[PDB]
Amino acid sequence: VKPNYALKFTLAGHTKAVSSVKFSPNGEWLASSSADKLIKIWGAYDGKFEKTISGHKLGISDVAWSSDSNLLVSASDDKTLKIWDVSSGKCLKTLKGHSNYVFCCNFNPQSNLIVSGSFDESVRIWDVKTGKCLKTLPAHSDPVSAVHFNRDGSLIVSSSYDGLCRIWDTASGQCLKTLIDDDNPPVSFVKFSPNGKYILAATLDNTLKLWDYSKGKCLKTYTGHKNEKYCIFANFSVTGGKWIVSGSEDNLVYIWNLQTKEIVQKLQGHTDVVISTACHPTENIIASAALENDKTIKLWKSDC
């Protein structure tokens, strides 16, 4: 069994590279962020433009949705994050504290906390209600590329150019596990698996790895794509067959069988690096976004 993702819509509007795409947890919306300093909201099923959200002073690297789909948080080169009310488009809070570019962000599932990572090498944990920084973790010795909470919010995972992944207890901010290989290329992406038992990590050695972080064992490896420079997001696709999905520096979306590690589809259409992909929470739909030769988001649909 293999998927048959086909292009359904191309979403144009951004005027520089598109950095991140995320489906809302209710499935209704797609949010995109860009080097053009803007967030755009689009209908998830037909790609219909909904609104533009503005206020950052420099490019945006990432966006993330609250669990109730009512808030977004964005991470900017302007050294701040902003919390946005999606309905009004208004900036509710500006999160100040990082000393350089903020690259990545996420709400916890509870959505009372935001986690962020920065070029400044720290991971910060922020109170959503007040906008205050609760903890600064001395997380890494090089830029932080990704941050993610697990399903119950009790853990955070971070990746860095220092070649490490680290697992942090949310409440205490203590490091519970450091994952360190024999060689240490930059770790460009990480997230927990749906069940929270594994982490999926990308390295700038053109490789994605699935790890049991408790046991420190690499269970699966996914290769054949191009990823030596950009911090490209990956995903577990779980609405149909169980796949791994990633963008690639050869302008394609790659899809792998999670168990066999075989490449099952390569989606062709973008004209620049595919830096972000997202999988819809209930339907077999992928959103992909590309850098400045392209500037578009594509929506793809499969029967499985």
Swiss-Prot record:
Changing residue 61 to F: Strongly reduced affinity for histone H3. Changing residue 77 to N: Strongly reduced affinity for histone H3. InterPro entries: G-protein_beta_WD-40_rep, WD40/YVTN_repeat-like_dom_sf, WD40_repeat_CS, WD40_repeat_dom_sf, WD40_rpt. The modification N6-acetyllysine is found at residue 82. GO terms for biological process: gluconeogenesis; negative regulation of transcription by RNA polymerase II; positive regulation of DNA-templated transcription; positive regulation of gluconeogenesis; regulation of cell cycle; regulation of cell division; regulation of DNA-templated transcription; regulation of embryonic development. GO terms for molecular function: histone binding; histone H3K4 methyltransferase activity; histone H3K4me1 reader activity; histone H3Q5ser reader activity. Keywords: Acetylation, Chromatin regulator, Host-virus interaction, Isopeptide bond, Nucleus, Repeat, Transcription, Transcription regulation, Ubl conjugation, WD repeat. SUPFAM superfamilies: WD40 repeat-like. It is found in: Nucleus. Changing residue 291 to A: Abolishes histone H3 binding. Interacts with PAXBP1; the interaction is direct and links a WDR5-containing histone methyltransferase complex to PAX7 and PAX3. Interacts with HCFC1. Component of the ATAC complex, a complex with histone acetyltransferase activity on histones H3 and H4. Component of the SET1 complex, at least composed of the catalytic subunit (SETD1A or SETD1B), WDR5, WDR82, RBBP5, ASH2L/ASH2, CXXC1/CFP1, HCFC1 and DPY30. Core component of several methyltransferase-containing complexes including MLL1/MLL, MLL2/3 (also named ASCOM complex) and MLL4/WBP7. This is WD repeat-containing protein 5. It comes from Homo sapiens (Human).
